[PDB]
PDB file of all heavy atoms in Angstrom:
ATOM      1  N   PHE P   1      14.090 -13.145   6.263  1.00 21.97           N
ATOM      2  CA  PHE P   1      14.723 -12.340   5.264  1.00 21.97           C
ATOM      3  C   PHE P   1      16.220 -12.621   5.170  1.00 21.97           C
ATOM      4  O   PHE P   1      16.775 -12.889   4.074  1.00 21.97           O
ATOM      5  CB  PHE P   1      14.485 -10.864   5.528  1.00 21.97           C
ATOM      6  CG  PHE P   1      15.129  -9.972   4.514  1.00 21.97           C
ATOM      7  CD1 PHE P   1      14.541  -9.737   3.263  1.00 21.97           C
ATOM      8  CD2 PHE P   1      16.296  -9.290   4.786  1.00 21.97           C
ATOM      9  CE1 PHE P   1      15.128  -8.913   2.358  1.00 21.97           C
ATOM     10  CE2 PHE P   1      16.886  -8.465   3.890  1.00 21.97           C
ATOM     11  CZ  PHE P   1      16.288  -8.237   2.662  1.00 21.97           C
ATOM     12  N   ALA P   2      16.907 -12.656   6.317  1.00 19.50           N
ATOM     13  CA  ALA P   2      18.293 -12.887   6.412  1.00 19.50           C
ATOM     14  C   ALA P   2      18.686 -14.334   6.061  1.00 19.50           C
ATOM     15  O   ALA P   2      19.856 -14.637   5.843  1.00 19.50           O
ATOM     16  CB  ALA P   2      18.797 -12.556   7.829  1.00 19.50           C
ATOM     17  N   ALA P   3      17.707 -15.238   6.110  1.00 21.07           N
ATOM     18  CA  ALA P   3      17.957 -16.596   5.706  1.00 21.07           C
ATOM     19  C   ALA P   3      17.677 -16.827   4.225  1.00 21.07           C
ATOM     20  O   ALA P   3      18.297 -17.738   3.610  1.00 21.07           O
ATOM     21  CB  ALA P   3      17.076 -17.574   6.471  1.00 21.07           C
ATOM     22  N   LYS P   4      16.768 -16.076   3.595  1.00 21.16           N
ATOM     23  CA  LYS P   4      16.592 -16.122   2.163  1.00 21.16           C
ATOM     24  C   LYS P   4      17.671 -15.368   1.452  1.00 21.16           C
ATOM     25  O   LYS P   4      18.417 -15.938   0.653  1.00 21.16           O
ATOM     26  CB  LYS P   4      15.213 -15.549   1.812  1.00 21.16           C
ATOM     27  CG  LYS P   4      14.914 -15.542   0.298  1.00 21.16           C
ATOM     28  CD  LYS P   4      14.731 -16.960  -0.207  1.00 21.16           C
ATOM     29  CE  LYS P   4      14.114 -16.970  -1.601  1.00 21.16           C
ATOM     30  NZ  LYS P   4      15.046 -16.299  -2.559  1.00 21.16           N
ATOM     31  N   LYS P   5      17.777 -14.032   1.708  1.00 23.84           N
ATOM     32  CA  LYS P   5      18.955 -13.304   1.256  1.00 23.84           C
ATOM     33  C   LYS P   5      20.193 -13.828   1.974  1.00 23.84           C
ATOM     34  O   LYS P   5      20.116 -14.188   3.178  1.00 23.84           O
ATOM     35  CB  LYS P   5      18.785 -11.832   1.518  1.00 23.84           C
ATOM     36  CG  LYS P   5      19.701 -10.926   0.755  1.00 23.84           C
ATOM     37  CD  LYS P   5      19.218 -10.735  -0.649  1.00 23.84           C
ATOM     38  CE  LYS P   5      20.079  -9.718  -1.365  1.00 23.84           C
ATOM     39  NZ  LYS P   5      20.068  -8.384  -0.714  1.00 23.84           N
ATOM     40  N   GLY P   6      21.313 -13.877   1.294  1.00 26.93           N
ATOM     41  CA  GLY P   6      22.506 -14.470   1.900  1.00 26.93           C
ATOM     42  C   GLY P   6      23.131 -13.613   2.972  1.00 26.93           C
ATOM     43  O   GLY P   6      24.329 -13.255   2.896  1.00 26.93           O
ATOM     44  N   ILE P   7      22.388 -13.275   4.008  1.00 23.49           N
ATOM     45  CA  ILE P   7      22.810 -12.344   5.049  1.00 23.49           C
ATOM     46  C   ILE P   7      23.581 -13.107   6.080  1.00 23.49           C
ATOM     47  O   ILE P   7      23.193 -14.238   6.451  1.00 23.49           O
ATOM     48  CB  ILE P   7      21.644 -11.601   5.625  1.00 23.49           C
ATOM     49  CG1 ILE P   7      20.773 -10.985   4.550  1.00 23.49           C
ATOM     50  CG2 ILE P   7      22.088 -10.497   6.547  1.00 23.49           C
ATOM     51  CD1 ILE P   7      21.462  -9.921   3.770  1.00 23.49           C
ATOM     52  N   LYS P   8      24.693 -12.542   6.532  1.00 24.30           N
ATOM     53  CA  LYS P   8      25.457 -13.060   7.600  1.00 24.30           C
ATOM     54  C   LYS P   8      25.367 -12.039   8.773  1.00 24.30           C
ATOM     55  O   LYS P   8      25.581 -10.828   8.589  1.00 24.30           O
ATOM     56  CB  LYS P   8      26.894 -13.246   7.206  1.00 24.30           C
ATOM     57  CG  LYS P   8      27.039 -14.203   6.043  1.00 24.30           C
ATOM     58  CD  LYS P   8      26.624 -15.550   6.427  1.00 24.30           C
ATOM     59  CE  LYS P   8      27.554 -16.143   7.522  1.00 24.30           C
ATOM     60  NZ  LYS P   8      28.924 -16.185   7.004  1.00 24.30           N
ATOM     61  N   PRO P   9      25.029 -12.458   9.988  1.00 25.63           N
ATOM     62  CA  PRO P   9      24.865 -11.569  11.108  1.00 25.63           C
ATOM     63  C   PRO P   9      26.175 -10.804  11.408  1.00 25.63           C
ATOM     64  O   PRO P   9      27.246 -11.358  11.191  1.00 25.63           O
ATOM     65  CB  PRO P   9      24.457 -12.456  12.297  1.00 25.63           C
ATOM     66  CG  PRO P   9      23.828 -13.630  11.636  1.00 25.63           C
ATOM     67  CD  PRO P   9      24.656 -13.840  10.389  1.00 25.63           C
ATOM     68  N   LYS P  10      26.004  -9.575  11.857  1.00 25.51           N
ATOM     69  CA  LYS P  10      27.163  -8.710  12.031  1.00 25.51           C
ATOM     70  C   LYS P  10      28.031  -9.226  13.200  1.00 25.51           C
ATOM     71  O   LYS P  10      27.539  -9.907  14.095  1.00 25.51           O
ATOM     72  CB  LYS P  10      26.757  -7.300  12.330  1.00 25.51           C
ATOM     73  CG  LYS P  10      25.901  -6.645  11.238  1.00 25.51           C
ATOM     74  CD  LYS P  10      25.638  -5.191  11.672  1.00 25.51           C
ATOM     75  CE  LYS P  10      24.772  -5.205  12.964  1.00 25.51           C
ATOM     76  NZ  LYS P  10      24.587  -3.820  13.477  1.00 25.51           N
ATOM     77  N   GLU P  11      29.299  -8.900  13.149  1.00 23.62           N
ATOM     78  CA  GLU P  11      30.170  -9.101  14.261  1.00 23.62           C
ATOM     79  C   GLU P  11      29.937  -8.028  15.307  1.00 23.62           C
ATOM     80  O   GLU P  11      29.546  -6.882  14.959  1.00 23.62           O
ATOM     81  CB  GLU P  11      31.637  -9.133  13.822  1.00 23.62           C
ATOM     82  CG  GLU P  11      32.184  -7.832  13.299  1.00 23.62           C
ATOM     83  CD  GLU P  11      31.855  -7.573  11.853  1.00 23.62           C
ATOM     84  OE1 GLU P  11      30.966  -8.290  11.282  1.00 23.62           O
ATOM     85  OE2 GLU P  11      32.535  -6.714  11.216  1.00 23.62           O
ATOM     86  N   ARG P  12      30.142  -8.313  16.569  1.00 21.48           N
ATOM     87  CA  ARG P  12      29.980  -7.361  17.624  1.00 21.48           C
ATOM     88  C   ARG P  12      31.370  -6.768  17.975  1.00 21.48           C
ATOM     89  O   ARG P  12      31.979  -7.116  18.930  1.00 21.48           O
ATOM     90  CB  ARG P  12      29.337  -7.994  18.844  1.00 21.48           C
ATOM     91  CG  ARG P  12      27.918  -8.426  18.619  1.00 21.48           C
ATOM     92  CD  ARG P  12      27.076  -7.287  18.099  1.00 21.48           C
ATOM     93  NE  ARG P  12      25.713  -7.603  17.811  1.00 21.48           N
ATOM     94  CZ  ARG P  12      25.087  -7.422  16.691  1.00 21.48           C
ATOM     95  NH1 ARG P  12      25.743  -6.823  15.659  1.00 21.48           N
ATOM     96  NH2 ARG P  12      23.802  -7.729  16.502  1.00 21.48           N
ATOM     97  N   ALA P  13      31.815  -5.892  17.083  1.00 20.71           N
ATOM     98  CA  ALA P  13      33.105  -5.225  17.302  1.00 20.71           C
ATOM     99  C   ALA P  13      33.072  -4.275  18.515  1.00 20.71           C
ATOM    100  O   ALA P  13      34.026  -4.226  19.288  1.00 20.71           O
ATOM    101  CB  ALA P  13      33.537  -4.458  16.070  1.00 20.71           C
ATOM    102  N   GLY P  14      32.008  -3.511  18.632  1.00 15.96           N
ATOM    103  CA  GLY P  14      31.886  -2.565  19.718  1.00 15.96           C
ATOM    104  C   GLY P  14      31.122  -1.318  19.421  1.00 15.96           C
ATOM    105  O   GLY P  14      30.770  -1.082  18.288  1.00 15.96           O
ATOM    106  N   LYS P  15      30.883  -0.521  20.460  1.00 15.12           N
ATOM    107  CA  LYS P  15      30.145   0.706  20.273  1.00 15.12           C
ATOM    108  C   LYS P  15      30.970   1.808  19.610  1.00 15.12           C
ATOM    109  O   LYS P  15      30.400   2.663  18.933  1.00 15.12           O
ATOM    110  CB  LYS P  15      29.598   1.177  21.629  1.00 15.12           C
ATOM    111  CG  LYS P  15      28.509   2.200  21.577  1.00 15.12           C
ATOM    112  CD  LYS P  15      28.091   2.561  22.971  1.00 15.12           C
ATOM    113  CE  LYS P  15      27.413   1.343  23.657  1.00 15.12           C
ATOM    114  NZ  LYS P  15      26.952   1.670  25.031  1.00 15.12           N
ATOM    115  N   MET P  16      32.244   1.832  19.824  1.00 18.25           N
ATOM    116  CA  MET P  16      33.101   2.959  19.391  1.00 18.25           C
ATOM    117  C   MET P  16      33.468   2.820  17.923  1.00 18.25           C
ATOM    118  O   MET P  16      33.883   1.743  17.454  1.00 18.25           O
ATOM    119  CB  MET P  16      34.370   2.984  20.245  1.00 18.25           C
ATOM    120  CG  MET P  16      34.166   3.259  21.667  1.00 18.25           C
ATOM    121  SD  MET P  16      33.486   4.865  22.013  1.00 18.25           S
ATOM    122  CE  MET P  16      33.120   4.771  23.787  1.00 18.25           C
ATOM    123  N   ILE P  17      33.332   3.939  17.195  1.00 21.03           N
ATOM    124  CA  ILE P  17      33.783   4.049  15.859  1.00 21.03           C
ATOM    125  C   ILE P  17      34.613   5.300  15.678  1.00 21.03           C
ATOM    126  O   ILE P  17      34.500   6.260  16.466  1.00 21.03           O
ATOM    127  CB  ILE P  17      32.604   4.073  14.787  1.00 21.03           C
ATOM    128  CG1 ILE P  17      31.750   5.335  15.081  1.00 21.03           C
ATOM    129  CG2 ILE P  17      31.846   2.792  14.847  1.00 21.03           C
ATOM    130  CD1 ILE P  17      30.724   5.592  14.008  1.00 21.03           C
ATOM    131  N   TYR P  18      35.541   5.279  14.702  1.00 23.04           N
ATOM    132  CA  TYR P  18      36.525   6.354  14.557  1.00 23.04           C
ATOM    133  C   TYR P  18      35.793   7.560  13.958  1.00 23.04           C
ATOM    134  O   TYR P  18      35.274   7.499  12.851  1.00 23.04           O
ATOM    135  CB  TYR P  18      37.652   5.900  13.693  1.00 23.04           C
ATOM    136  CG  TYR P  18      38.860   6.839  13.815  1.00 23.04           C
ATOM    137  CD1 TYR P  18      39.582   6.911  14.967  1.00 23.04           C
ATOM    138  CD2 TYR P  18      39.155   7.731  12.790  1.00 23.04           C
ATOM    139  CE1 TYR P  18      40.633   7.759  15.107  1.00 23.04           C
ATOM    140  CE2 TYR P  18      40.221   8.592  12.898  1.00 23.04           C
ATOM    141  CZ  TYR P  18      40.946   8.620  14.044  1.00 23.04           C
ATOM    142  OH  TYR P  18      42.027   9.497  14.174  1.00 23.04           O
ATOM    143  N   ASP P  19      35.848   8.687  14.688  1.00 21.62           N
ATOM    144  CA  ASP P  19      35.356   9.944  14.188  1.00 21.62           C
ATOM    145  C   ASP P  19      36.513  10.624  13.425  1.00 21.62           C
ATOM    146  O   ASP P  19      37.387  11.200  14.055  1.00 21.62           O
ATOM    147  CB  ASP P  19      34.870  10.827  15.297  1.00 21.62           C
ATOM    148  CG  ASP P  19      34.293  12.146  14.831  1.00 21.62           C
ATOM    149  OD1 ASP P  19      33.150  12.114  14.229  1.00 21.62           O
ATOM    150  OD2 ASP P  19      34.900  13.179  15.036  1.00 21.62           O
ATOM    151  N   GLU P  20      36.521  10.531  12.099  1.00 20.76           N
ATOM    152  CA  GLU P  20      37.655  10.951  11.323  1.00 20.76           C
ATOM    153  C   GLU P  20      37.898  12.447  11.401  1.00 20.76           C
ATOM    154  O   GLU P  20      39.003  12.902  11.163  1.00 20.76           O
ATOM    155  CB  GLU P  20      37.538  10.506   9.866  1.00 20.76           C
ATOM    156  CG  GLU P  20      36.375  11.093   9.127  1.00 20.76           C
ATOM    157  CD  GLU P  20      36.142  10.454   7.767  1.00 20.76           C
ATOM    158  OE1 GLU P  20      36.032   9.208   7.765  1.00 20.76           O
ATOM    159  OE2 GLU P  20      36.146  11.136   6.747  1.00 20.76           O
ATOM    160  N   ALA P  21      36.852  13.211  11.755  1.00 24.63           N
ATOM    161  CA  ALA P  21      36.982  14.664  11.786  1.00 24.63           C
ATOM    162  C   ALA P  21      37.803  15.110  13.016  1.00 24.63           C
ATOM    163  O   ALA P  21      38.730  15.912  12.894  1.00 24.63           O
ATOM    164  CB  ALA P  21      35.619  15.360  11.767  1.00 24.63           C
ATOM    165  N   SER P  22      37.439  14.558  14.184  1.00 23.64           N
ATOM    166  CA  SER P  22      37.993  15.067  15.447  1.00 23.64           C
ATOM    167  C   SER P  22      39.119  14.200  16.009  1.00 23.64           C
ATOM    168  O   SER P  22      39.636  14.539  17.075  1.00 23.64           O
ATOM    169  CB  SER P  22      36.907  15.202  16.487  1.00 23.64           C
ATOM    170  OG  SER P  22      36.310  13.918  16.757  1.00 23.64           O
ATOM    171  N   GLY P  23      39.522  13.145  15.322  1.00 20.06           N
ATOM    172  CA  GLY P  23      40.608  12.339  15.799  1.00 20.06           C
ATOM    173  C   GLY P  23      40.324  11.701  17.124  1.00 20.06           C
ATOM    174  O   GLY P  23      41.157  11.606  18.011  1.00 20.06           O
ATOM    175  N   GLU P  24      39.088  11.171  17.301  1.00 22.84           N
ATOM    176  CA  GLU P  24      38.677  10.514  18.513  1.00 22.84           C
ATOM    177  C   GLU P  24      37.920   9.253  18.143  1.00 22.84           C
ATOM    178  O   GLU P  24      37.486   9.082  17.007  1.00 22.84           O
ATOM    179  CB  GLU P  24      37.818  11.405  19.426  1.00 22.84           C
ATOM    180  CG  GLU P  24      38.526  12.632  19.980  1.00 22.84           C
ATOM    181  CD  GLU P  24      39.588  12.323  20.957  1.00 22.84           C
ATOM    182  OE1 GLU P  24      39.511  11.319  21.685  1.00 22.84           O
ATOM    183  OE2 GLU P  24      40.561  13.092  21.055  1.00 22.84           O
ATOM    184  N   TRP P  25      37.667   8.404  19.130  1.00 22.14           N
ATOM    185  CA  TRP P  25      36.690   7.349  18.926  1.00 22.14           C
ATOM    186  C   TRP P  25      35.406   7.675  19.654  1.00 22.14           C
ATOM    187  O   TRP P  25      35.408   7.789  20.893  1.00 22.14           O
ATOM    188  CB  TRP P  25      37.273   5.988  19.421  1.00 22.14           C
ATOM    189  CG  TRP P  25      38.372   5.495  18.619  1.00 22.14           C
ATOM    190  CD1 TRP P  25      39.695   5.852  18.688  1.00 22.14           C
ATOM    191  CD2 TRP P  25      38.331   4.534  17.528  1.00 22.14           C
ATOM    192  NE1 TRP P  25      40.403   5.189  17.792  1.00 22.14           N
ATOM    193  CE2 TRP P  25      39.618   4.372  17.031  1.00 22.14           C
ATOM    194  CE3 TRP P  25      37.279   3.789  17.007  1.00 22.14           C
ATOM    195  CZ2 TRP P  25      39.889   3.512  16.016  1.00 22.14           C
ATOM    196  CZ3 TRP P  25      37.577   2.909  15.940  1.00 22.14           C
ATOM    197  CH2 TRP P  25      38.899   2.809  15.477  1.00 22.14           C
ATOM    198  N   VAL P  26      34.346   7.881  18.879  1.00 28.13           N
ATOM    199  CA  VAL P  26      33.038   8.297  19.384  1.00 28.13           C
ATOM    200  C   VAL P  26      32.113   7.089  19.226  1.00 28.13           C
ATOM    201  O   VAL P  26      32.135   6.415  18.205  1.00 28.13           O
ATOM    202  CB  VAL P  26      32.528   9.491  18.596  1.00 28.13           C
ATOM    203  CG1 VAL P  26      31.131   9.937  19.121  1.00 28.13           C
ATOM    204  CG2 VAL P  26      33.505  10.681  18.718  1.00 28.13           C
ATOM    205  N   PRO P  27      31.266   6.776  20.226  1.00 27.78           N
ATOM    206  CA  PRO P  27      30.393   5.618  20.101  1.00 27.78           C
ATOM    207  C   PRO P  27      29.321   5.891  19.051  1.00 27.78           C
ATOM    208  O   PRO P  27      28.977   7.029  18.771  1.00 27.78           O
ATOM    209  CB  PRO P  27      29.755   5.507  21.490  1.00 27.78           C
ATOM    210  CG  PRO P  27      29.873   6.874  22.051  1.00 27.78           C
ATOM    211  CD  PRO P  27      31.160   7.419  21.546  1.00 27.78           C
ATOM    212  N   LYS P  28      28.825   4.827  18.417  1.00 27.61           N
ATOM    213  CA  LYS P  28      27.762   4.984  17.436  1.00 27.61           C
ATOM    214  C   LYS P  28      26.494   5.583  18.049  1.00 27.61           C
ATOM    215  O   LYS P  28      25.863   6.459  17.433  1.00 27.61           O
ATOM    216  CB  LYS P  28      27.436   3.698  16.724  1.00 27.61           C
ATOM    217  CG  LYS P  28      28.622   2.772  16.350  1.00 27.61           C
ATOM    218  CD  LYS P  28      28.088   1.459  15.880  1.00 27.61           C
ATOM    219  CE  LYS P  28      29.197   0.471  15.770  1.00 27.61           C
ATOM    220  NZ  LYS P  28      28.961  -0.533  14.642  1.00 27.61           N
ATOM    221  N   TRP P  29      26.111   5.096  19.206  1.00 30.54           N
ATOM    222  CA  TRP P  29      24.867   5.502  19.823  1.00 30.54           C
ATOM    223  C   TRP P  29      25.104   5.610  21.351  1.00 30.54           C
ATOM    224  O   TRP P  29      26.262   5.467  21.787  1.00 30.54           O
ATOM    225  CB  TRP P  29      23.790   4.448  19.529  1.00 30.54           C
ATOM    226  CG  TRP P  29      24.159   3.127  20.017  1.00 30.54           C
ATOM    227  CD1 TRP P  29      25.012   2.245  19.428  1.00 30.54           C
ATOM    228  CD2 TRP P  29      23.690   2.516  21.179  1.00 30.54           C
ATOM    229  NE1 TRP P  29      25.110   1.123  20.180  1.00 30.54           N
ATOM    230  CE2 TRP P  29      24.290   1.249  21.257  1.00 30.54           C
ATOM    231  CE3 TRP P  29      22.786   2.907  22.188  1.00 30.54           C
ATOM    232  CZ2 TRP P  29      24.037   0.336  22.291  1.00 30.54           C
ATOM    233  CZ3 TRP P  29      22.532   2.029  23.215  1.00 30.54           C
ATOM    234  CH2 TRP P  29      23.150   0.754  23.263  1.00 30.54           C
ATOM    235  N   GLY P  30      24.043   5.872  22.081  1.00 28.41           N
ATOM    236  CA  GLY P  30      24.204   5.960  23.529  1.00 28.41           C
ATOM    237  C   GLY P  30      24.669   7.322  23.984  1.00 28.41           C
ATOM    238  O   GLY P  30      24.477   8.354  23.342  1.00 28.41           O
ATOM    239  N   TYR P  31      25.340   7.304  25.125  1.00 30.64           N
ATOM    240  CA  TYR P  31      25.884   8.524  25.778  1.00 30.64           C
ATOM    241  C   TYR P  31      26.840   9.269  24.809  1.00 30.64           C
ATOM    242  O   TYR P  31      27.957   8.799  24.536  1.00 30.64           O
ATOM    243  CB  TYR P  31      26.563   8.198  27.044  1.00 30.64           C
ATOM    244  CG  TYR P  31      26.749   9.323  28.050  1.00 30.64           C
ATOM    245  CD1 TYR P  31      25.701  10.109  28.387  1.00 30.64           C
ATOM    246  CD2 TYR P  31      27.954   9.518  28.694  1.00 30.64           C
ATOM    247  CE1 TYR P  31      25.833  11.132  29.298  1.00 30.64           C
ATOM    248  CE2 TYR P  31      28.089  10.513  29.616  1.00 30.64           C
ATOM    249  CZ  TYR P  31      27.028  11.349  29.925  1.00 30.64           C
ATOM    250  OH  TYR P  31      27.186  12.338  30.857  1.00 30.64           O
ATOM    251  N   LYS P  32      26.392  10.453  24.354  1.00 29.87           N
ATOM    252  CA  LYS P  32      27.085  11.232  23.299  1.00 29.87           C
ATOM    253  C   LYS P  32      27.510  10.359  22.171  1.00 29.87           C
ATOM    254  O   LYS P  32      28.689  10.334  21.750  1.00 29.87           O
ATOM    255  CB  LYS P  32      28.274  11.990  23.913  1.00 29.87           C
ATOM    256  CG  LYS P  32      27.862  13.022  24.930  1.00 29.87           C
ATOM    257  CD  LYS P  32      29.063  13.814  25.386  1.00 29.87           C
ATOM    258  CE  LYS P  32      29.935  12.927  26.280  1.00 29.87           C
ATOM    259  NZ  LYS P  32      29.185  12.555  27.538  1.00 29.87           N
ATOM    260  N   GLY P  33      26.537   9.635  21.614  1.00 30.74           N
ATOM    261  CA  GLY P  33      26.777   8.785  20.465  1.00 30.74           C
ATOM    262  C   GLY P  33      27.019   9.617  19.235  1.00 30.74           C
ATOM    263  O   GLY P  33      26.608  10.757  19.122  1.00 30.74           O
ATOM    264  N   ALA P  34      27.671   9.006  18.282  1.00 33.38           N
ATOM    265  CA  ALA P  34      27.943   9.692  17.007  1.00 33.38           C
ATOM    266  C   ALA P  34      26.698   9.927  16.156  1.00 33.38           C
ATOM    267  O   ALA P  34      26.841  10.435  15.076  1.00 33.38           O
ATOM    268  CB  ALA P  34      28.981   8.913  16.202  1.00 33.38           C
TER     269      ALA P  34
END
């Protein structure tokens, strides 16, 4: 699918994403993930 559709694999930036509500970086998943 990703070779037919012009898909580019994601970059591995990291688990943490910015929780804009609480002013913290909360991980997407895992231990208390977002």
Side-chain angles (χ1 to χ4, degrees):
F1 181 77
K4 181 67 168 62
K5 197 82 175 298
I7 309 295
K8 300 296 295 301
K10 301 182 297 176
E11 69 275 16
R12 295 306 180 233
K15 197 180 293 182
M16 297 295 173
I17 62 170
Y18 194 72
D19 183 72
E20 64 191 53
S22 61
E24 294 293 328
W25 292 83
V26 178
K28 319 171 192 214
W29 60 282
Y31 201 49
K32 296 183 289 294

